[PDB]
Amino acid sequence: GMSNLETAKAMIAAYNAQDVDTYVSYMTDDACEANYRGDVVREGKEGTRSGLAAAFARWPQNHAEIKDAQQVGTYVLMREHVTRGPATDGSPLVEPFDVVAVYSFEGDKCSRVEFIR
Amino acid sequence: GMSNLETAKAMIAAYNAQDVDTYVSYMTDDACEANYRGDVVREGKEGTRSGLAAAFARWPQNHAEIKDAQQVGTYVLMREHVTRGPATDGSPLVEPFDVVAVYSFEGDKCSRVEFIR
């Protein structure tokens, strides 16, 4: 079916649509989101589900603009420009920032997403 | 002085020139080269020195062509197309391949290079 590149792209679409359940549907049960060579930020499919849902609630306008998308072997790398927009929780405007998201894959499911910032 | 991007670029120049000592001069003493989320392939400044020197001996024509170079925070990512060329040791022609090299930095020195392939 979808290439890993197409899958990562479907995830980011889902992310930009703030469709949590669609986003996590592409992951392994144990998939995490983590900082590159660093800590896990969302643990497991379910931690990702609840964590994104919370981010989306805090930042309803949250958007990632894809600047570069590459498939390298089974890995997908996407350079993303992220704009939180105004928070709902009284917290201050997070300034736009850039990251590279590295998607690992096990078969056709995303096993990890790591952030380089 | 040099940005981290300029430093990574100096390393790759040195690499393409097969100038081992120049390449490692930009690294921390404990810097490693490793597979992304995987094993160390060259351990320490000195393991990198001896390991590159051995690669270069095996593949004197070895070349990395930079396809994309980005600095993200302190990290540098370079998408590289690598051509080993004919080996000196009777081993068969390694077909050209693509990788992304992720350079970590501690201050102005490279603390790690990881390969996504």
Question: Which residues, at least 6 apart from B98, have a Cβ–Cβ distance to it below 8 Å?
Answer: A72, B67, B79, B80, B81, B82, B117
Cβ contacts from A onto B, under 8 A: 42
B7: phi then psi, degrees, rounded to nearest 5: -65, -50
Method: X-ray
Sign of the Cα torsion B79, A117, A87, A60 reads positive
The answer to whether the beta carbons of residues A80 and A11 sit under 8 Å apart is no
Distance CA(B13)–CA(B92), nearest Å, equals 26
Spatial CA neighbour of A117 closest among A99, A91, A93, A90: A99
Spatial CA neighbour of B22 closest among B32, B31, B12: B12
User: How many residues appear in chain A?
Assistant: 117
- Give the pairing type, strands A109-116 and A27-35: parallel
Q: How far is B99 from chain A (nearest CA, A)?
A: 7
What amino acid occupies position B65? E
The answer to whether the beta carbons of residues A100 and A115 sit under 8 Å apart is yes
Of B37, B73, B98, the CB nearest to A117: B73
DSSP B81-93: EEE--S-SSSPPP
Q: How far is B81 from chain A (nearest CA, A)?
A: 11
Question: Which residues, at least 6 apart from B6, have a Cβ–Cβ distance to it below 8 Å?
Answer: none
- Give this entry's resolution in angstroms: 1.9
Question: Cβ of B116 and A102 within 8 Å?
Answer: yes
DSSP secondary structure code for residue B62 in this structure: -
Question: Cβ of A116 and B75 within 8 Å?
Answer: yes
- List b or e across B83-96, with b for residues whose CB sees 16 or more CB atoms inside 10 angstroms: ebeebeeeeeeeee
Q: How far is B25 from chain A (nearest CA, A)?
A: 23
Question: Which residues, at least 6 apart from A104, have a Cβ–Cβ distance to it below 8 Å?
Answer: A74, A75, A110, A111, A112, A113, A114, B37
CA dist B12 to A38, B9, B83, B99, B101, Å?
A: 26, 5, 14, 13, 10
Distance CA(B77)–CA(A80), nearest Å, equals 14
The answer to whether the beta carbons of residues B84 and B94 sit under 8 Å apart is yes
Distance CA(A115)–CA(A98), nearest Å, equals 10
CA dist B53 to A107, B31, B42, B101, B104, Å?
A: 36, 16, 11, 19, 22
Please state whether B55 falls in left (phi above 0), alpha (psi between -120 and 50) or beta: alpha
Within 10 angstroms of residue A95's Cβ, the number of other Cβ atoms is 8
Question: Which residues, at least 6 apart from A113, have a Cβ–Cβ distance to it below 8 Å?
Answer: A31, A32, A33, A34, A101, A102, A103, A104
B3: phi then psi, degrees, rounded to nearest 5: -70, 170
Helix H or strand E encompassing A108: none
Question: Cβ of B73 and A104 within 8 Å?
Answer: no
For residue B100, give the chain A residue with the closest CA.
A72
The answer to whether the beta carbons of residues A114 and B36 sit under 8 Å apart is no
Domains of chain A by residue range = 1-117
Spatial CA neighbour of A73 closest among B96, B79, B99: B99
Q: Which residues of chain A neighbour B104 with C-beta distances below 8 Å?
A: 37
Q: Which residues pair with A109 in a beta bridge?
A: A106
Sign of the Cα torsion B71, B75, B76, B80 reads negative
Distance CA(A109)–CA(A74), nearest Å, equals 10
A1-117 fold = Nuclear Transport Factor 2; Chain: A, (3.10.450)
Tokens read off for A75: 């890995």
Q: How far is A77 from chain B (nearest CA, A)?
A: 9
- The alpha carbon torsion through A36, A71, B33, B82 (nearest 10 deg) reads -160
For residue B35, give the chain A residue with the closest CA.
A37
Question: Which residues, at least 6 apart from B48, have a Cβ–Cβ distance to it below 8 Å?
Answer: B23, B24, B27, B31, B32, B33, B42
B24: phi then psi, degrees, rounded to nearest 5: -75, -20
Spatial CA neighbour of A74 closest among A13, A14, A12, A3: A3
